[PDB]
Design a binder for these strands. Structure first.
Ligand code: K
Ligand code: K
Ligand code: K
Ligand code: K
Ligand code: K
Ligand code: MG
Ligand code: MG
Ligand code: MG
Ligand code: MG
Ligand code: MG
Ligand code: MG
Ligand code: MG
Ligand code: MG
Ligand code: MG
Ligand code: MG
Ligand code: MG
Ligand code: MG
Ligand code: MG
Ligand code: MG
Ligand code: MG
Ligand code: MG
Ligand code: MG
Ligand code: MG
Lengths: 134, 124, 64, 117, 88, 372, 96, 88, 35
RNA sequence: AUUCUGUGAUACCUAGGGGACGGGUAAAGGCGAAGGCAAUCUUUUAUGUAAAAACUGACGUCGAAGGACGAAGGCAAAGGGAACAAAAAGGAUUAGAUACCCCAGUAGUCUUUGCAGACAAUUAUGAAUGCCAUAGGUUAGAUUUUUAAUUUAGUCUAUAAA
RNA sequence: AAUAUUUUUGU
C-alpha cells in the first residue's frame, strides 16, 4: 500500500504542473505541450467583458444584495480596482458608489464581508467569538 | 470556545507581546525593557528575538503548552519585531506551541480619515 | 412623467381591453360559473389598477 | 416617487414588527401612496454591534417596504421611524432614475435575483 | 482597464542592470549559523552540522560569470519604432 | 468606370484575402488569460504558401520579404499575417501549421460530419438538399423551418440579459408597424380560403379592427403566437412543439468546411487480408486522467472525451512520451459554438495489430508466422 | 409620427405598470392581510429565524456567471418561456 | 452564533485559518500576500504625518506616471522579444 | 512523434520545478538546530 | 533630556459617551465664471455635452464703472473643543540656536451671523470669432455589417508646414 | 525598502 500511496502523491504533483484545462473541441499542436506554453507566464486571470453590461443591471438599485457587495470589496473591506473587476469607468463608478451607499447607509460592514456570509465560508467553526466576560 | 491569543505589537522603537485567554485577559504582558534594554536597544531585531524566546519560555514554566489546545497569533504593526517573534514561533523555540495554532490575523490600526496627524518633519 | 389625462385614459382603456378574459368560443361550450366569475374578478382587478395608477401619475407626488 | 425603506428593529418581539410596518403602511395609504411590496426578512447579524438607547444589539429583525408616495409622505414616514425607539436604524433610498420606463419594472423585492434596469 | 502607453521619445531605451545580480550564496549559510547561536547557543552541538556547511562554502570556488545579456542591443533597434522616437 | 489600375487591384490575390472572422465564441461571463493565448478552436486568419524558389528569398506576396530564420527549414511552408504593416513597420506574422496541418490530420481520418443525434444511431449527412439550405420564401411554414441551419435572428436562451435587452429595444421594438402588416397578409389569406373552398363546391384586409382583434384571440393559445413572431424575426425554434435546438443552432455551417465527405459507409480493401470490418485505428494521447470526472484524449490535434470504459486511471511519469492508446473515431460533429466534437470509441485488438503490419511495429507478424 | 412613437412607448410603460398592479396594496384591508400572512414567528422554517435559512444566500456574482458559463441543465425551459413572452409582448404589445 | 456572537472587527477581515492543506507557515504567507496587496504597510506610513490636499495630489501624479511609464516599458521589452522571435 | 519529444521536455521541466518547490516548503520552517 | 507610571501606566478587554475628519474606489478622470468641489441618504439649484426632429429669426461677441462672488490666514459675537497647532513655555543640538528635532501647548482650524478683499487667485499665457497637415492615448455620448471602424464635444502626449 | 548627529568663513 506504500508504493500505491507514494505513486498517488507523485502523480498529483505532476497534475499541478499542467496549468491548463483541456476541453472538448480544443485544437492542440505539438507546441501546446512544451514548458513555455504550460509555464503560464500570464499572471492574470482577468475578466473578458463588463459584467454590468452583460447582466444588464443597475448596481445602484441592487444595494440590498449583501453578496453583491462582498464580491466587489477585498476581504479588508476595500473596493476592488478596475483591474480586478474589469469594468468600464462608468460601471466601475456605479459599483463603487453602490458599495459606498450600502456601507454609508449602515447595512453592510466596512472592514470585512457580511457576517452571515462569513458563516458560510471556510473556517465556519473557527470564527472569532465574543466571550460574555461576566 | 474561543482560542487563546498571542498578540504581537511592534513599532519602530519597541515591541510588546501579550498572551491572553479566551476572554481576552492578559496572562503574560511583557516588553523588551523587561529584559534590561534601555532606551535604544528595545528597537533592535535581536532584543525582539530574546523577548519572544523569553515569553515562550515563560509559557512552558506555566504549563501552557499542555493547557492551550487552540491559540491565535495576532500581529499589530510592522516594526522589526514582526519578523523576529514569528521566527521564534516558527523555529525550535516554539515547536511545542506551534501545533495549537489555528488562526493567524492582523490587527494593525488604520484610520479612514480620522484625526489630523502631526505635520511632516524637516530633518535634512 | 410627461403624461396627461388623455394619454393616461387611453392606456387604461387599452390595457383593460387587451387583458379582458376572452369568452368561450361558442355558447353551448361556455361555462357561466367561470365566465361570470372572471368578469367580476377582472372588473375588481381593473378598479384596483386604475386607483393605483392614478396615484403614481399624480403630479402632486412629483419633485421640483 | 418610488422610494424604499429598509428598517431594522429589535429581535425581541414579532408583534413590534407588525405595529411598525402597519403604522408606516397606513400612513402611506392615508396620504395617497401605493405600497408595492413588503418583504419580511428574518433576524440575522448586523454589520456590527451598535448600541441604541442604552441597549447593545447584535442582530435585528429586518424588513423592506417599497412604496410610491410623495416627498412629504416619505420624509414623514422616515421621521416617525427614527423617533421610534424600537428601530435600530433605517436605510431610505430613491429607486430608479425617475423615468417612467424604468419605474414600471420595480416589483417584489428580489433576494435570489437582480433588479434588471 | 487601459492598455500600456506609447512611451515618450527617450534618449536611449535600455535597462540599467541587464544581467541579474548574483547574490553571494555563503551569505545565506552564515545567516543560518547565526540563527542557531541565537536559539541553541554558541558552544553547543546543534550548530555543528550548520557550522561545517559554512566552512565548506567559503572553501568551494565561486562560480564563473555568466555571458552578458544582449537585451539592450535589441531595445536600441526598435526604439524609434516602439516609442515616439529618439530625443537628444 | 473604374480606371484600369483599379480594375487589376480588385482581381488581385492580396485583395482576395478574407477579413479576420471573430474568434470562436466563448463564455462571456468568465475569466481568461491576456499575456498568453493558445491555439484557437478554428482558424481565424488565412494560411498562406509560396513557391520553394520564392521561400529561399522570403517572398510570400506580402508588403516585405519575411525573415529566413523562422520561415525556412520546415517541410510545410505556412504562415498567418495578423498585420501586413504594423506601427513597427514590420509584417506581424506567425506560423500557421497549428491549424494548417490539423485540417490535414482530420481529413486523413476519412470521416464525414453528421447532424447531432439525441440519446439507434442514424448518421445523416450534412450536405443535402433538404437540410443544407439557406434561401427561403414566406410560404414555408414552421414544418420546414426545422431543416434550415442559418437563421437571421439570435438564439434567445443563449443571449445574455444585456444582449437580450439591446435586441428587444433596438431590433424588436421598432418593428411593430411592419409586423402589423405581416398579420394583414395572413388575414388576407384566411378570407381567401373560405372563398376558394366555397367556389369549388383576395380581400385587401387593411383594417386595424381585424388585426387588433385577431391578436386578442391568440392570447389564450400563446403557442400558435410564438410560431408567428419567430417567422417574422427568423428565430431558431426552442420549444419542441425539434431541430436539435436544445443547445441552439450552429454559428456556422454544420460542417465548418473541414470535411466535405457525406457518408462513411465504405470498406477499405486491404491488399492481403481483403475488405476489413471497420476503419483503421488511430493512436490517441491521454490528457487529464480521471483521478475531473472525465478523461481527455488527443485524436488528430482535437481534444475529445475518452471511450466509455491502466492509462486512464492514474498518471504514470515512467511512461516515456506519455500514455498512448489506439482508438477508433466513431462519429464527428460540430456543436453550436463551432467546436469539432468527436465520438471516440474504443478500437479492437486485431485492427491495431493489422495497422502495425504495414509499419513494422507488430511483434509477431500476422502473415506467415501466425499459426493460428 | 415621431411624437406618436414617444406617446406609444409611454403607453406601454403604463400597461406594464397596469399588469403589476395585482400585488400592490391600495387599502388598509390588503395591508393587514399581507402583514399577518408574512410576519409570523414561524415563517422562515421554524429551524431558523432568518431569511438566510429558507433562501440560504442572496444571488452572488459566482452564481450569476454560473447560469451562463457553468450550465451553458433545465433552467432554459423556465427562462425561454419568460423570454419568448417578452419578445411577443414587445411586437404585439398585448402584455401577455 | 446562537449563544456567542461573532467578534466583528477590522481584524476579523484580516484573518486566515489553519486547515489540512494550509499549515501555520502557509497561513502567514497568505496573510503577508494579502496585507501587501491591500497596501496596509503603505497606509501606516502615509498616516504617520499629515499631507495637505495639494501635496497628496502632486505626489499621486508623480507616482501615477512612474507606474504608467513602467507598464509601457515592460510592454516594449516584451514586444522586442516577440519581434526578435520572428526574425525581425 | 513530435508530441513525444515535446512531452518529454515538459516532464523534465515538471520534475525539476516540483523538486524545487519541496525546498521552499521545507525552508519555510526552521530546523537548523538539529534537535 | 524635559515628560508619563506603583494615586497601578504601556500592553489586552468590557460598557457608556464626545467632537472633527473621509480608507479603498482613483484615472493623463470629471464638475463650475473663477475661487474651488471627493464617505452616505432625502430635499433643492443654474449652465454645459451627444443624437436626431421642431421652433424663434441676428435676438451676437467684448465690456470702463457700479454691483455680486472670491482661497488660507485674520477681526467681531455666540457655540464647540477630540485631534492638529502660530503664540507663550521648557528639554536638547550647537562656537552661539531666536531656529531645524523633542516633551507639552493657547489662539486658530469646525458651526452660525457680519466685516475684510490682499494670493505663484498660474496655463507665469484675458475673453471671443474665423482658419492650418497628421499620429498615439484618454473622457462622455452617437451611429453602424455593435466583431471593429466612423463621428460630435473635451482633455493630454509626439510631430509636419510654420 | 521609509533610512536621516554636527560641519561657518575666504581683502
Ligand atoms: K485600570
Ligand atoms: K465643462
Ligand atoms: K502636539
Ligand atoms: K463682501
Ligand atoms: K484626440
Ligand atoms: Mg512592559
Ligand atoms: Mg511639533
Ligand atoms: Mg542637519
Ligand atoms: Mg460622530
Ligand atoms: Mg485651482
Ligand atoms: Mg478617497
Ligand atoms: Mg460676455
Ligand atoms: Mg468691474
Ligand atoms: Mg475666511
Ligand atoms: Mg474664521
Ligand atoms: Mg472669538
Ligand atoms: Mg527653545
Ligand atoms: Mg471654512
Ligand atoms: Mg489659490
Ligand atoms: Mg476680461
Ligand atoms: Mg482632464
Ligand atoms: Mg505638445
Ligand atoms: Mg568672496
Amino acid at each position: 500500500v506504500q508504493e500505491l500511496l507514494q505513486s498517488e502523491v507523485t502523480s498529483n504533483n505532476y497534475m499541478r504542473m499542467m496549468r491548463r484545462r483541456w476541453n472538448n473541441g480544443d485544437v492542440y499542436a505539438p507546441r501546446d505541450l512544451s514548458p513555455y506554453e504550460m509555464k503560464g507566464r500570464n499572471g492574470g486571470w482577468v475578466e473578458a467583458a463588463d459584467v454590468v453590461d452583460e447582466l444588464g443591471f443597475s448596481p445602484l438599485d441592487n444595494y440590498r444584495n449583501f453578496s453583491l457587495i462582498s464580491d466587489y470589496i477585498t476581504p479588508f473591506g476595500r473596493i476592488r480596482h478596475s483591474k480586478e473587476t474589469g469594468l468600464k469607468p462608468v460601471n466601475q463608478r456605479k459599483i463603487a458608489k453602490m458599495v459606498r451607499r450600502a456601507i454609508g447607509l449602515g447595512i453592510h460592514p466596512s472592514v470585512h464581508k457580511h457576517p452571515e456570509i462569513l458563516k458560510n465560508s471556510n473556517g465556519r467553526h473557527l470564527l472569532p467569538l465574543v466571550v460574555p466576560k461576566g | 470556545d474561543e482560542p487563546y491569543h498571542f498578540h504581537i505589537y511592534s513599532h519602530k522603537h519597541n515591541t510588546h507581546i501579550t498572551v491572553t485567554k479566551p476572554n481576552r485577559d492578559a496572562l503574560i504582558s511583557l516588553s523588551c525593557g523587561n529584559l534590561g534594554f534601555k532606551k535604544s536597544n528595545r528597537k533592535h531585531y535581536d532584543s525582539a528575538y530574546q523577548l519572544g524566546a523569553y515569553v515562550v519560555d515563560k509559557m512552558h514554566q506555566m504549563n501552557l503548552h499542555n493547557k492551550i489546545k487552540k491559540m491565535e497569533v495576532v500581529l499589530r504593526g510592522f516594526g522589526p519585531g514582526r519578523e523576529a517573534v514569528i521566527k521564534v514561533l516558527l523555529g525550535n523555540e516554539g515547536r511545542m506551541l506551534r501545533s495549537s495554532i489555528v488562526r493567524v490575523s492582523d490587527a494593525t490600526r488604520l484610520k479612514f480619515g480620522g484625526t489630523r496627524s502631526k505635520k511632516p518633519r524637516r530633518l535634512g | 412623467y410627461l403624461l396627461n389625462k388623455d394619454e393616461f385614459d387611453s392606456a387604461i382603456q387599452y390595457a383593460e381591453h387587451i387583458l379582458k378574459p376572452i369568452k368561450a368560443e361558442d355558447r353551448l361550450t361556455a361555462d357561466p360559473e367561470k365566465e361570470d366569475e372572471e368578469a367580476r374578478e377582472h372588473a375588481a382587478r381593473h378598479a384596483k389598477a386604475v386607483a393605483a395608477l392614478e396615484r403614481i401619475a399624480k403630479l402632486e407626488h412629483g419633485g421640483a | 416617487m418610488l422610494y424604499e425603506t429598509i428598517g431594522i428593529v429589535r429581535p425581541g418581539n414579532i408583534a413590534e414588527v407588525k405595529e411598525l410596518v402597519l403604522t408606516a403602511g397606513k400612513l402611506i395609504l392615508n396620504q395617497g401612496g401605493v405600497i408595492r411590496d413588503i418583504k419580511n426578512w428574518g433576524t440575522f447579524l448586523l454589520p456590527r454591534p451598535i448600541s441604541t438607547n442604552q441597549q447593545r444589539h447584535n442582530r435585528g429583525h429586518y424588513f423592506v417596504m417599497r412604496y410610491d408616495a410623495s416627498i412629504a409622505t416619505h420624509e414623514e414616514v422616515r421621521r416617525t421611524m427614527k423617533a421610534d425607539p424600537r428601530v435600530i436604524r433605517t436605510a431610505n433610498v430613491k429607486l430608479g432614475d425617475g423615468k417612467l420606463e424604468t419605474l414600471s419594472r420595480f416589483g417584489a423585492i428580489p433576494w435570489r435575483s437582480l433588479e434588471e434596469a | 482597464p487601459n492598455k500600456p502607453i506609447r512611451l515618450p521619445p527617450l534618449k536611449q531605451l535600455r535597462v540599467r542592470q541587464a544581467n541579474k545580480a548574483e547574490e553571494n550564496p555563503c551569505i545565506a549559510v552564515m545567516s543560518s549559523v547565526l540563527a542557531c547561536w541565537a536559539s541553541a547557543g554558541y558552544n553547543s552541538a546543534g550548530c555543528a552540522t550548520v557550522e561545517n556547511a559554512l566552512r565548506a562554502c567559503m572553501d568551494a570556488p565561486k562560480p564563473a560569470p555568466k555571458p552578458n545579456n544582449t537585451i539592450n542591443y535589441h531595445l536600441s533597434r526598435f526604439q524609434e519604432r516602439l516609442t515616439q522616437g529618439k530625443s537628444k | 468606370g473604374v480606371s484600369p489600375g483599379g480594375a487589376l487591384l480588385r482581381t488581385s490575390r492580396m485583395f482576395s484575402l478574407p477579413p479576420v472572422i471573430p474568434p470562436p465564441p466563448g463564455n462571456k461571463l468568465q475569466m481568461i488569460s491576456e499575456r498568453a493565448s493558445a491555439t484557437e478552436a478554428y482558424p481565424t486568419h488565412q494560411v498562406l504558401t509560396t513557391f520553394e524558389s520564392s521561400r529561399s528569398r522570403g517572398d510570400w506576396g506580402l508588403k516585405r520579404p519575411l525573415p529566413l530564420k523562422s520561415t525556412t527549414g520546415t517541410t510545410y511552408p505556412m504562415v498567418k499575417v495578423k498585420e501586413m504593416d504594423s506601427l513597427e513597420q514590420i509584417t506581424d506574422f506567425t506560423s500557421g501549421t497549428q491549424h494548417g496541418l490539423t485540417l490535414k490530420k482530420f481529413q486523413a481520418l476519412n470521416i464525414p460530419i453528421s447532424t447531432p443525434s439525441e440519446i439507434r444511431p442514424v448518421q445523416r449527412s450534412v450536405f443535402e438538399a433538404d437540410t443544407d439550405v439557406t434561401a427561403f420564401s414566406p410560404d414555408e411554414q414552421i414544418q420546414e423551418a426545422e431543416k434550415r441551419w442559418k437563421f437571421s435572428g439570435p438564439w434567445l436562451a443563449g443571449m445574455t440579459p444585456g444582449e437580450f435587452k439591446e435586441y428587444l429595444a433596438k431590433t424588436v421594438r421598432p418593428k411593430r408597424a411592419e409586423f402589423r402588416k405581416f398579420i394583414q397578409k395572413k388575414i388576407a389569406a384566411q378570407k381567401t380560403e373560405a372563398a376558394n373552398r366555397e367556389l369549388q363546391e383576395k380581400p385587401e384586409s387593411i383594417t386595424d379592427d381585424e388585426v387588433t382583434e385577431y391578436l386578442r384571440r391568440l392570447r389564450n393559445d400563446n403557442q400558435v403566437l410564438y410560431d408567428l413572431v419567430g417567422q417574422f424575426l427568423d428565430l431558431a425554434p426552442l420549444k419542441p412543439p425539434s431541430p436539435y435546438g436544445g443547445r441552439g443552432p450552429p454559428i456556422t455551417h454544420p460542417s465548418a468546411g473541414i470535411s466535405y465527405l457525406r457518408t462513411a459507409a465504405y470498406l477499405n480493401n486491404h491488399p492481403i487480408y481483403g475488405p476489413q470490418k471497420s476503419h483503421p485505428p488511430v493512436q490517441a494521447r491521454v490528457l487529464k486522467p480521471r483521478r475531473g470526472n472525465d478523461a481527455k484524449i488527443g485524436v488528430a490535434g482535437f481534444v475529445a472525451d475518452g471511450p466509455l470504459g491502466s492509462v486512464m486511471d492514474k498518471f504514470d511519469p515512467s511512461i516515456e512520451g506519455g500514455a498512448k492508446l489506439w482508438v477508433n473515431v466513431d462519429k464527428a460533429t460540430v456543436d453550436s459554438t463551432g467546436r469539432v466534437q468527436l465520438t471516440v470509441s474504443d478500437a479492437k485488438a486485431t485492427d491495431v495489430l493489422i495497422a502495425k503490419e504495414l509499419i513494422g511495429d507488430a511483434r509477431e507478424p500476422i502473415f506467415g508466422s501466425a499459426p493460428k | 409620427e415621431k411624437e406618436a412613437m414617444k406617446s406609444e412607448a409611454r403607453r406601454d410603460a403604463v400597461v406594464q405598470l397596469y399588469v403589476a398592479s395585482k400585488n400592490f396594496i391600495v387599502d388598509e384591508k390588503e395591508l393587514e392581510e399581507h402583514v399577518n400572512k408574512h410576519f409570523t414567528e414561524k415563517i422562515h422554517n421554524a429551524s431558523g429565524r432568518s431569511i438566510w435559512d429558507s433562501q440560504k444566500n442572496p444571488i452572488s456574482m459566482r452564481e450569476l456567471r454560473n447560469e451562463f458559463s457553468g450550465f451553458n441543465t433545465t433552467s432554459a425551459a423556465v427562462k425561454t418561456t419568460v423570454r419568448q413572452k417578452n419578445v411577443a409582448e414587445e411586437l404585439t404589445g398585448g402584455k401577455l | 452564533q446562537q449563544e456567542l456572537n461573532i467578534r466583528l472587527r477590522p481584524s476579523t477581515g484580516r484573518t486566515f485559518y489553519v486547515s489540512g492543506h494550509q499549515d501555520f507557515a502557509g497561513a502567514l504567507k497568505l496573510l503577508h500576500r494579502t496585507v501587501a496587496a491591500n497596501k496596509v504597510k503603505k497606509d501606516v506610513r502615509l498616516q504617520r504625518f499629515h499631507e495637505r490636499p495639494a501635496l497628496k495630489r502632486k505626489r499621486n501624479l508623480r507616482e501615477r506616471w512612474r507606474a504608467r511609464f513602467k507598464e509601457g516599458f515592460k510592454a516594449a521589452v516584451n514586444r522586442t522579444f516577440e519581434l526578435k522571435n520572428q526574425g525581425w | 512523434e513530435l508530441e513525444n519529444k515535446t512531452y518529454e521536455s515538459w516532464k523534465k521541466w515538471a520534475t525539476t520545478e516540483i523538486a524545487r518547490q519541496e525546498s521552499a516548503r521545507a525552508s519555510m520552517y526552521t530546523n537548523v538546530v538539529d534537535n
